[PDB]
């Protein structure tokens, strides 16, 4: 990506407080607190151990990219959806989708179920999988 990167950097900048081009336990703890509650030592510790050596803007983009890897397109997903949208209305009836995910294929769980719909864009009975495919993607 190129705009995904532009952010990453500017981000790494705001995170790398002691502006030393590296991210340290104090760097993370620092900025977190300046905003919302921050992680405990143990959280911060294993949070760094996730990166072999020093956190230059490189090992950074490395672990972040290796996260977002192993996923499909916004087009590839929007279709796996329209695959249940026979009439091609660009919406799925809420009871339907919930039913699919819940007890079909690789059954979800109530939490997976709640976590998922806590965000979901459902209004008028129909769950718009387009808007939701975007939200979940780009």
């Amino acid at each position: 990506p190129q705009k995904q990167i532009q952010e990453m950097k500017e981000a790494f900048s705001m995170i790398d407080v002691d502006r030393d081009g590296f991210v340290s336990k104090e760097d993370i703890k620092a900025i977190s607190e300046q905003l919302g509650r921050a992680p405990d030592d143990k959280e911060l510790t294993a949070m760094l151990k996730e990166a072999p050596g020093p956190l230059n803007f490189t090992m950074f983009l490395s672990i972040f990219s290796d996260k977002l890897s192993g996923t499909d397109s916004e087009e590839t997903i929007r279709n796996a959806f329209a695959m249940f949208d026979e009439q091609e209305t660009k919406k799925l009836n809420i009871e339907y989708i919930k039913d699919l995910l819940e007890n079909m294929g690789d059954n979800f769980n109530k939490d997976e179920m709640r976590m998922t719909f806590k965000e979901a864009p459902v209004e008028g009975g129909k769950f718009d999988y387009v808007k939701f495919t975007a939200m979940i993607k780009g």
Partner: protein, 153 residues
């Protein structure tokens, strides 16, 4: 007794199903019909229950171990030839000229023998694209041939 490429086929399909009713290596005995209906065969409901099928979902699930013999079973069961379907349909033709009316055909399917929901009917009608003439009659010979043909001929 089945062959390998055969048993493999049972395997193939068993998955598509066992997955859809929640993947876990077990299939709802209420689907054992449709499973075999996919491997070509068309048993009769009377037929399926005989081997293990059930009237409702939830009732019970089955492994692939118990599944093998249900298919060994539903194999040795009688399939209807063209002769038979032609014979039976003749008994509703007073004219004798291979006709019948939509309305009556509908009656035969929905009302006689192991009934067929009103939906499956409008279904297959539309599928096979069966059409009536001005008098509202249809050549039952054509119809039987399509149904026999398959969804993809």
């Amino acid at each position: 007794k089945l062959s390998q490429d055969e048993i493999d086929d049972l395997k193939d399909v068993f998955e598509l199903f066992d997955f859809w009713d929640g993947r876990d290596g077990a299939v709802d005995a209420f689907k054992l019909g449709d499973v075999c209906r996919c491997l070509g065969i068309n048993p009769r409901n009377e037929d399926v229950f005989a081997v293990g099928g059930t009237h409702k979902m939830g009732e019970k699930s089955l492994p692939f171990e118990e599944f093998l013999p249900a298919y060994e079973g539903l194999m040795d069961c009688e399939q209807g030839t063209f002769a038979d379907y032609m014979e039976a349909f003749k008994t509703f033709d007073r004219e004798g000229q291979g006709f019948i009316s939509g309305a009556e055909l509908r009656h035969v399917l929905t009302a006689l023998g192991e009934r067929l929901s009103d939906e499956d009917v409008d279904e297959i009608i539309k599928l096979t694209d069966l059409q009536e003439d001005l008098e509202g009659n249809v050549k039952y010979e054509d119809f039987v041939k399509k149904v026999m043909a398959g969804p993809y001929p």
